[PDB]
Amino acid sequence: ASAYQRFEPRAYLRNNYAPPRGDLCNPNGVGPWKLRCLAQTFATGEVSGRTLIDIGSGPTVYQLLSACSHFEDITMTDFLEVNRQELGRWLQEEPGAFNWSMYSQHACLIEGKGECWQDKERQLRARVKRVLPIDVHQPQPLGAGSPAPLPADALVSAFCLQAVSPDLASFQRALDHITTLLRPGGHLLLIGALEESWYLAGEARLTVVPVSEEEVREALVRSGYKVRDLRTYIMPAHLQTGVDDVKGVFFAWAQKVG
Ligand SMILES: Nc1ncnc2c1ncn2[C@@H]1O[C@H](CSCC[C@H](N)C(=O)O)[C@@H](O)[C@H]1O
Ligand SMILES: NC[C@H](O)c1ccc(O)cc1
């Protein structure tokens, strides 16, 4: 955990959202795959409501590109101040903000509604009402009197739980904790690394729990979810770059049981 005090937003973005992993031209890449899972899930029209919360957003927003057109009140979160400040720079279009345009363009491409990427980013920025601190290790991850509308109609969490858990049990509890934020019958979109044990973020070296698809499924079930969809992307050699040892990426569409 204290290892996250050395976490460098720019280094994390560089490692994971800049070429090669950040080049979206090849459909077989991890970027396009993640956006497709998100887009396809929301296109079903079955994941809807008013409020949504992004768990452990870090300094990234790609994970809300397709989502933002389905929820008018969006809450982004992260444990680190530096990350909340990094997000702020993009949301407020401040100087030095990260360039997500490639991802916006591709979310527009995939969605196929003829929408220009600027309108997309406009909508995301418009619907993100607040960026809050969060600790998934606490029974109440957002705290006591959080400005976030609870319970949420839906939750999105990408590369967080597994990335902040040393073992499987921590992972399960973390899932339990965030699940309390979700209204019954609500929906969870979980994206995470498969069989990864570490990843770098500048001077920071994060040690994480290598999980499998079955282990992830079993966790969702234990937390009281119905798994609507669980998919795996196997990481191509070309995208294995020594910023980590991830073998694949999973996407889970879980619905909290009423
Ligand atoms: N105890 C905790 N609770 C919630 N988030 C935590 C946490 N400890 C670290 N984090 C955050 O977990 C994030 C993992 S990086 C994930 C970034 C983004 N969601 C993605 O799709 O790439 C980091 O920003 C880190 O600050
Ligand atoms: N914990 C984040 C993990 O290292 C990761 C993040 C993003 C990727 O595309 C691949 C792997």
mmCIF file of C-alpha atoms and ligand atoms in Angstrom:
data_model
loop_
_atom_site.group_PDB
_atom_site.id
_atom_site.type_symbol
_atom_site.label_atom_id
_atom_site.label_comp_id
_atom_site.label_asym_id
_atom_site.label_seq_id
_atom_site.Cartn_x
_atom_site.Cartn_y
_atom_site.Cartn_z
ATOM 1 C CA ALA A 1 0.000 0.000 0.000
ATOM 2 C CA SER A 2 2.712 2.465 1.023
ATOM 3 C CA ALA A 3 4.237 1.517 -2.325
ATOM 4 C CA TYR A 4 1.491 3.626 -3.912
ATOM 5 C CA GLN A 5 3.036 6.725 -2.349
ATOM 6 C CA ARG A 6 5.683 6.547 -5.079
ATOM 7 C CA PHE A 7 3.089 5.960 -7.828
ATOM 8 C CA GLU A 8 3.718 8.292 -10.787
ATOM 9 C CA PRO A 9 0.613 9.114 -12.886
ATOM 10 C CA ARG A 10 2.639 10.150 -15.957
ATOM 11 C CA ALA A 11 4.701 6.952 -15.770
ATOM 12 C CA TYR A 12 1.597 4.799 -15.408
ATOM 13 C CA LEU A 13 -0.088 6.449 -18.401
ATOM 14 C CA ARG A 14 3.110 6.185 -20.416
ATOM 15 C CA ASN A 15 3.441 2.488 -19.563
ATOM 16 C CA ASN A 16 -0.135 1.500 -20.326
ATOM 17 C CA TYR A 17 -1.856 4.058 -22.534
ATOM 18 C CA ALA A 18 0.893 5.128 -24.913
ATOM 19 C CA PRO A 19 2.188 2.983 -27.799
ATOM 20 C CA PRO A 20 2.453 0.088 -28.182
ATOM 21 C CA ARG A 21 -0.432 -0.671 -25.790
ATOM 22 C CA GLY A 22 -1.769 2.802 -26.508
ATOM 23 C CA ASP A 23 -1.761 2.501 -30.293
ATOM 24 C CA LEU A 24 -5.385 1.813 -31.191
ATOM 25 C CA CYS A 25 -5.016 1.257 -34.947
ATOM 26 C CA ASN A 26 -4.729 -2.532 -34.626
ATOM 27 C CA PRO A 27 -8.095 -4.093 -33.649
ATOM 28 C CA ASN A 28 -6.291 -7.021 -32.007
ATOM 29 C CA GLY A 29 -4.814 -4.715 -29.373
ATOM 30 C CA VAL A 30 -5.796 -4.510 -25.706
ATOM 31 C CA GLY A 31 -7.046 -0.936 -26.025
ATOM 32 C CA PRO A 32 -9.656 -1.658 -28.717
ATOM 33 C CA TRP A 33 -10.667 -4.861 -26.908
ATOM 34 C CA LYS A 34 -11.386 -3.023 -23.645
ATOM 35 C CA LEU A 35 -13.396 -0.325 -25.409
ATOM 36 C CA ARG A 36 -15.398 -2.985 -27.254
ATOM 37 C CA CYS A 37 -16.350 -4.779 -24.052
ATOM 38 C CA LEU A 38 -17.496 -1.490 -22.572
ATOM 39 C CA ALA A 39 -19.331 -0.287 -25.688
ATOM 40 C CA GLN A 40 -21.048 -3.601 -26.405
ATOM 41 C CA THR A 41 -22.227 -3.888 -22.805
ATOM 42 C CA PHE A 42 -23.857 -0.445 -22.788
ATOM 43 C CA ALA A 43 -25.312 -0.887 -26.284
ATOM 44 C CA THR A 44 -27.523 -3.654 -24.888
ATOM 45 C CA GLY A 45 -29.381 -0.826 -23.160
ATOM 46 C CA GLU A 46 -29.588 -3.062 -20.101
ATOM 47 C CA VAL A 47 -27.129 -1.065 -18.006
ATOM 48 C CA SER A 48 -28.837 2.232 -17.251
ATOM 49 C CA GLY A 49 -29.794 4.654 -14.503
ATOM 50 C CA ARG A 50 -28.942 8.125 -13.237
ATOM 51 C CA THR A 51 -25.760 7.803 -11.172
ATOM 52 C CA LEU A 52 -22.502 5.922 -11.745
ATOM 53 C CA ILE A 53 -19.256 5.616 -9.786
ATOM 54 C CA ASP A 54 -15.773 4.869 -11.115
ATOM 55 C CA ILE A 55 -13.702 2.927 -8.572
ATOM 56 C CA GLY A 56 -9.973 3.671 -8.511
ATOM 57 C CA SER A 57 -10.066 5.767 -11.680
ATOM 58 C CA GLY A 58 -6.398 6.632 -11.434
ATOM 59 C CA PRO A 59 -5.467 9.159 -14.129
ATOM 60 C CA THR A 60 -7.525 7.499 -16.884
ATOM 61 C CA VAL A 61 -10.964 8.196 -18.364
ATOM 62 C CA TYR A 62 -11.213 5.768 -21.299
ATOM 63 C CA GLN A 63 -13.266 3.487 -19.055
ATOM 64 C CA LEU A 64 -16.172 5.957 -19.051
ATOM 65 C CA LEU A 65 -16.272 6.953 -22.721
ATOM 66 C CA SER A 66 -19.133 4.638 -23.655
ATOM 67 C CA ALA A 67 -20.659 4.797 -20.181
ATOM 68 C CA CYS A 68 -21.069 8.570 -20.015
ATOM 69 C CA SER A 69 -23.994 8.601 -22.453
ATOM 70 C CA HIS A 70 -26.042 6.407 -20.097
ATOM 71 C CA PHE A 71 -25.591 8.162 -16.742
ATOM 72 C CA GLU A 72 -26.147 11.873 -16.113
ATOM 73 C CA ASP A 73 -24.348 11.944 -12.759
ATOM 74 C CA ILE A 74 -20.869 10.408 -12.789
ATOM 75 C CA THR A 75 -18.510 10.178 -9.817
ATOM 76 C CA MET A 76 -14.820 9.485 -10.405
ATOM 77 C CA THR A 77 -12.561 8.371 -7.553
ATOM 78 C CA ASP A 78 -9.008 7.492 -6.521
ATOM 79 C CA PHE A 79 -6.895 6.847 -3.440
ATOM 80 C CA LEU A 80 -4.114 9.188 -4.597
ATOM 81 C CA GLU A 81 -4.209 12.992 -4.663
ATOM 82 C CA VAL A 82 -1.776 13.136 -7.594
ATOM 83 C CA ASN A 83 -4.198 11.056 -9.658
ATOM 84 C CA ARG A 84 -7.206 13.156 -8.672
ATOM 85 C CA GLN A 85 -5.172 16.195 -9.704
ATOM 86 C CA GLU A 86 -4.217 14.533 -12.992
ATOM 87 C CA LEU A 87 -7.878 13.844 -13.786
ATOM 88 C CA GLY A 88 -8.726 17.421 -12.884
ATOM 89 C CA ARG A 89 -6.312 18.615 -15.552
ATOM 90 C CA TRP A 90 -8.187 16.696 -18.260
ATOM 91 C CA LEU A 91 -11.692 17.455 -16.992
ATOM 92 C CA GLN A 92 -10.955 21.186 -16.774
ATOM 93 C CA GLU A 93 -8.960 21.053 -20.020
ATOM 94 C CA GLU A 94 -6.038 22.553 -18.083
ATOM 95 C CA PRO A 95 -2.467 22.633 -19.467
ATOM 96 C CA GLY A 96 -0.446 19.421 -19.369
ATOM 97 C CA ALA A 97 -3.535 17.226 -19.463
ATOM 98 C CA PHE A 98 -3.187 13.762 -20.985
ATOM 99 C CA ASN A 99 -4.350 13.317 -24.579
ATOM 100 C CA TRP A 100 -7.213 10.814 -24.622
ATOM 101 C CA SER A 101 -8.460 11.878 -28.059
ATOM 102 C CA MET A 102 -7.352 8.586 -29.669
ATOM 103 C CA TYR A 103 -9.538 6.639 -27.237
ATOM 104 C CA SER A 104 -12.468 9.034 -27.689
ATOM 105 C CA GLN A 105 -12.209 8.683 -31.455
ATOM 106 C CA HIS A 106 -12.193 4.893 -31.148
ATOM 107 C CA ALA A 107 -15.114 4.795 -28.729
ATOM 108 C CA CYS A 108 -16.993 6.850 -31.320
ATOM 109 C CA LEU A 109 -15.803 4.468 -34.019
ATOM 110 C CA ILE A 110 -16.879 1.350 -32.131
ATOM 111 C CA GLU A 111 -20.219 2.778 -30.982
ATOM 112 C CA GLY A 112 -21.037 3.645 -34.585
ATOM 113 C CA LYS A 113 -23.469 6.476 -33.890
ATOM 114 C CA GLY A 114 -21.613 8.906 -36.148
ATOM 115 C CA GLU A 115 -20.607 10.984 -33.130
ATOM 116 C CA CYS A 116 -17.534 13.214 -33.295
ATOM 117 C CA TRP A 117 -14.993 12.674 -30.532
ATOM 118 C CA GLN A 118 -15.227 16.270 -29.275
ATOM 119 C CA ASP A 119 -18.931 15.842 -28.493
ATOM 120 C CA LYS A 120 -18.047 12.613 -26.688
ATOM 121 C CA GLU A 121 -15.425 14.288 -24.503
ATOM 122 C CA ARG A 122 -17.792 17.197 -23.963
ATOM 123 C CA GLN A 123 -20.434 14.819 -22.602
ATOM 124 C CA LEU A 124 -18.006 12.947 -20.346
ATOM 125 C CA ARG A 125 -16.625 16.167 -18.867
ATOM 126 C CA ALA A 126 -20.172 17.468 -18.445
ATOM 127 C CA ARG A 127 -21.474 14.439 -16.562
ATOM 128 C CA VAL A 128 -18.490 13.961 -14.245
ATOM 129 C CA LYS A 129 -19.741 15.988 -11.290
ATOM 130 C CA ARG A 130 -17.005 15.183 -8.783
ATOM 131 C CA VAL A 131 -13.642 13.503 -8.195
ATOM 132 C CA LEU A 132 -13.437 11.952 -4.727
ATOM 133 C CA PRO A 133 -10.845 10.126 -2.594
ATOM 134 C CA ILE A 134 -11.588 6.464 -1.894
ATOM 135 C CA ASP A 135 -10.188 3.420 -0.101
ATOM 136 C CA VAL A 136 -11.641 0.074 -1.156
ATOM 137 C CA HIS A 137 -10.063 -1.412 1.965
ATOM 138 C CA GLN A 138 -12.584 0.373 4.176
ATOM 139 C CA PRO A 139 -16.074 -1.101 4.763
ATOM 140 C CA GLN A 140 -17.257 2.323 3.607
ATOM 141 C CA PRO A 141 -14.800 3.106 0.760
ATOM 142 C CA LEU A 142 -16.140 6.630 0.171
ATOM 143 C CA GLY A 143 -16.443 7.466 3.862
ATOM 144 C CA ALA A 144 -19.294 8.723 6.033
ATOM 145 C CA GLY A 145 -20.870 11.799 4.451
ATOM 146 C CA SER A 146 -19.722 11.510 0.845
ATOM 147 C CA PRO A 147 -21.149 13.939 -1.765
ATOM 148 C CA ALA A 148 -21.658 10.924 -4.033
ATOM 149 C CA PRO A 149 -25.318 9.930 -4.583
ATOM 150 C CA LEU A 150 -25.746 6.532 -2.941
ATOM 151 C CA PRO A 151 -26.559 3.900 -3.657
ATOM 152 C CA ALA A 152 -25.202 4.014 -7.212
ATOM 153 C CA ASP A 153 -27.191 2.651 -10.148
ATOM 154 C CA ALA A 154 -23.981 1.136 -11.535
ATOM 155 C CA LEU A 155 -20.254 0.757 -10.820
ATOM 156 C CA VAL A 156 -17.183 0.673 -13.058
ATOM 157 C CA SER A 157 -13.798 -0.558 -11.836
ATOM 158 C CA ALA A 158 -10.770 -1.047 -14.083
ATOM 159 C CA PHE A 159 -7.428 -2.377 -12.858
ATOM 160 C CA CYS A 160 -8.117 -1.470 -9.236
ATOM 161 C CA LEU A 161 -9.184 -4.251 -6.855
ATOM 162 C CA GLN A 162 -6.639 -6.832 -8.007
ATOM 163 C CA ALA A 163 -4.098 -4.014 -8.316
ATOM 164 C CA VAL A 164 -4.513 -3.077 -4.641
ATOM 165 C CA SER A 165 -4.716 -6.570 -3.142
ATOM 166 C CA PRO A 166 -1.727 -8.686 -2.004
ATOM 167 C CA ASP A 167 -3.742 -11.917 -1.885
ATOM 168 C CA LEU A 168 -7.076 -13.376 -2.952
ATOM 169 C CA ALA A 169 -8.823 -12.656 0.365
ATOM 170 C CA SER A 170 -8.016 -8.943 0.237
ATOM 171 C CA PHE A 171 -9.387 -8.995 -3.290
ATOM 172 C CA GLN A 172 -12.665 -10.568 -2.157
ATOM 173 C CA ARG A 173 -13.174 -8.142 0.726
ATOM 174 C CA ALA A 174 -12.359 -5.161 -1.478
ATOM 175 C CA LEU A 175 -15.073 -6.415 -3.834
ATOM 176 C CA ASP A 176 -17.433 -6.817 -0.889
ATOM 177 C CA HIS A 177 -16.706 -3.248 0.180
ATOM 178 C CA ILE A 178 -17.391 -1.581 -3.152
ATOM 179 C CA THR A 179 -20.486 -3.752 -3.616
ATOM 180 C CA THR A 180 -22.157 -1.913 -0.720
ATOM 181 C CA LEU A 181 -22.027 1.203 -2.917
ATOM 182 C CA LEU A 182 -24.212 -0.474 -5.533
ATOM 183 C CA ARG A 183 -28.008 -0.557 -5.335
ATOM 184 C CA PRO A 184 -29.610 -4.016 -5.515
ATOM 185 C CA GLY A 185 -30.238 -4.967 -9.135
ATOM 186 C CA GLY A 186 -27.438 -2.563 -9.998
ATOM 187 C CA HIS A 187 -24.661 -3.338 -12.466
ATOM 188 C CA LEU A 188 -20.901 -3.699 -12.093
ATOM 189 C CA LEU A 189 -18.407 -3.523 -14.937
ATOM 190 C CA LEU A 190 -15.109 -4.971 -13.740
ATOM 191 C CA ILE A 191 -11.909 -4.933 -15.809
ATOM 192 C CA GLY A 192 -8.621 -6.271 -14.483
ATOM 193 C CA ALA A 193 -5.301 -7.983 -15.086
ATOM 194 C CA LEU A 194 -5.110 -11.778 -15.351
ATOM 195 C CA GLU A 195 -2.258 -13.694 -13.727
ATOM 196 C CA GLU A 196 -0.285 -10.514 -13.030
ATOM 197 C CA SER A 197 1.968 -10.308 -9.962
ATOM 198 C CA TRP A 198 3.540 -6.870 -10.407
ATOM 199 C CA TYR A 199 3.480 -3.687 -12.464
ATOM 200 C CA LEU A 200 5.568 -0.517 -12.495
ATOM 201 C CA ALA A 201 4.575 3.128 -12.198
ATOM 202 C CA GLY A 202 7.792 5.126 -12.183
ATOM 203 C CA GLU A 203 9.766 4.743 -8.964
ATOM 204 C CA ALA A 204 6.789 2.738 -7.692
ATOM 205 C CA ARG A 205 6.745 -1.044 -7.889
ATOM 206 C CA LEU A 206 3.303 -2.511 -7.151
ATOM 207 C CA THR A 207 3.027 -6.109 -5.917
ATOM 208 C CA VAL A 208 -0.332 -7.668 -6.798
ATOM 209 C CA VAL A 209 -2.414 -10.827 -6.633
ATOM 210 C CA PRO A 210 -2.306 -13.058 -9.763
ATOM 211 C CA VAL A 211 -5.948 -14.031 -10.321
ATOM 212 C CA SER A 212 -7.642 -16.359 -12.804
ATOM 213 C CA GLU A 213 -10.952 -16.097 -14.635
ATOM 214 C CA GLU A 214 -12.533 -18.738 -12.388
ATOM 215 C CA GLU A 215 -11.234 -16.978 -9.278
ATOM 216 C CA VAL A 216 -12.763 -13.724 -10.520
ATOM 217 C CA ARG A 217 -16.085 -15.388 -11.303
ATOM 218 C CA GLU A 218 -16.183 -17.125 -7.942
ATOM 219 C CA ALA A 219 -15.472 -13.801 -6.231
ATOM 220 C CA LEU A 220 -18.354 -12.042 -7.969
ATOM 221 C CA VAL A 221 -20.677 -14.873 -6.950
ATOM 222 C CA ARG A 222 -19.532 -14.761 -3.330
ATOM 223 C CA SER A 223 -20.127 -11.004 -3.299
ATOM 224 C CA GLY A 224 -23.713 -11.649 -4.359
ATOM 225 C CA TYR A 225 -23.472 -10.956 -8.080
ATOM 226 C CA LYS A 226 -24.947 -12.686 -11.088
ATOM 227 C CA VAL A 227 -22.270 -12.890 -13.772
ATOM 228 C CA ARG A 228 -23.919 -11.708 -16.991
ATOM 229 C CA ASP A 229 -20.664 -11.768 -18.945
ATOM 230 C CA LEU A 230 -17.044 -12.719 -18.328
ATOM 231 C CA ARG A 231 -14.483 -12.463 -21.136
ATOM 232 C CA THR A 232 -10.733 -12.873 -21.427
ATOM 233 C CA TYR A 233 -8.185 -11.146 -23.626
ATOM 234 C CA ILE A 234 -4.874 -12.972 -23.922
ATOM 235 C CA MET A 235 -1.974 -10.507 -24.026
ATOM 236 C CA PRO A 236 -0.038 -10.804 -27.318
ATOM 237 C CA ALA A 237 3.757 -11.048 -27.130
ATOM 238 C CA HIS A 238 4.000 -7.667 -28.836
ATOM 239 C CA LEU A 239 2.228 -5.985 -25.903
ATOM 240 C CA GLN A 240 4.336 -7.651 -23.218
ATOM 241 C CA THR A 241 6.722 -4.801 -22.501
ATOM 242 C CA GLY A 242 8.365 -5.267 -19.121
ATOM 243 C CA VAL A 243 6.210 -2.632 -17.434
ATOM 244 C CA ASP A 244 4.566 -5.681 -15.849
ATOM 245 C CA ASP A 245 4.012 -9.427 -16.221
ATOM 246 C CA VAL A 246 0.292 -9.457 -17.102
ATOM 247 C CA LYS A 247 -0.742 -12.525 -19.122
ATOM 248 C CA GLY A 248 -4.240 -11.351 -20.031
ATOM 249 C CA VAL A 249 -7.131 -9.023 -19.215
ATOM 250 C CA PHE A 250 -10.620 -9.941 -18.022
ATOM 251 C CA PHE A 251 -13.924 -8.133 -18.494
ATOM 252 C CA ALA A 252 -16.841 -8.855 -16.157
ATOM 253 C CA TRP A 253 -20.446 -7.700 -16.369
ATOM 254 C CA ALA A 254 -21.971 -8.543 -12.992
ATOM 255 C CA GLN A 255 -25.442 -7.641 -11.746
ATOM 256 C CA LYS A 256 -26.011 -7.307 -8.000
ATOM 257 C CA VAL A 257 -28.773 -9.685 -6.924
ATOM 258 C CA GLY A 258 -31.955 -8.010 -5.685
HETATM 259 N N1 LIG B 1 -6.591 1.373 -1.117
HETATM 260 C C1 LIG B 1 -7.026 1.843 -2.424
HETATM 261 N N2 LIG B 1 -8.332 1.990 -2.687
HETATM 262 C C2 LIG B 1 -8.707 2.433 -3.915
HETATM 263 N N3 LIG B 1 -7.778 2.725 -4.864
HETATM 264 C C3 LIG B 1 -6.476 2.573 -4.592
HETATM 265 C C4 LIG B 1 -6.087 2.139 -3.388
HETATM 266 N N4 LIG B 1 -4.718 2.086 -3.402
HETATM 267 C C5 LIG B 1 -4.267 2.498 -4.643
HETATM 268 N N5 LIG B 1 -5.338 2.801 -5.370
HETATM 269 C C6 LIG B 1 -5.353 3.267 -6.747
HETATM 270 O O1 LIG B 1 -5.637 2.239 -7.626
HETATM 271 C C7 LIG B 1 -5.303 2.762 -8.863
HETATM 272 C C8 LIG B 1 -4.793 1.643 -9.757
HETATM 273 S S1 LIG B 1 -4.303 2.163 -11.419
HETATM 274 C C9 LIG B 1 -5.870 1.990 -12.321
HETATM 275 C C10 LIG B 1 -6.063 3.181 -13.261
HETATM 276 C C11 LIG B 1 -7.291 3.021 -14.169
HETATM 277 N N6 LIG B 1 -8.469 2.614 -13.423
HETATM 278 C C12 LIG B 1 -7.020 2.044 -15.307
HETATM 279 O O2 LIG B 1 -8.148 1.484 -15.921
HETATM 280 O O3 LIG B 1 -5.948 2.122 -15.791
HETATM 281 C C13 LIG B 1 -4.217 3.790 -8.591
HETATM 282 O O4 LIG B 1 -4.619 5.037 -9.105
HETATM 283 C C14 LIG B 1 -4.116 3.811 -7.213
HETATM 284 O O5 LIG B 1 -3.904 5.110 -6.721
HETATM 285 N N1 LIG B 2 -2.500 -2.988 -13.010
HETATM 286 C C1 LIG B 2 -2.568 -2.468 -14.359
HETATM 287 C C2 LIG B 2 -1.982 -3.517 -15.288
HETATM 288 O O1 LIG B 2 -0.594 -3.565 -15.134
HETATM 289 C C3 LIG B 2 -2.363 -3.220 -16.736
HETATM 290 C C4 LIG B 2 -3.034 -2.041 -17.063
HETATM 291 C C5 LIG B 2 -3.393 -1.797 -18.389
HETATM 292 C C6 LIG B 2 -3.077 -2.733 -19.376
HETATM 293 O O2 LIG B 2 -3.421 -2.503 -20.713
HETATM 294 C C7 LIG B 2 -2.410 -3.906 -19.045
HETATM 295 C C8 LIG B 2 -2.050 -4.149 -17.726
#
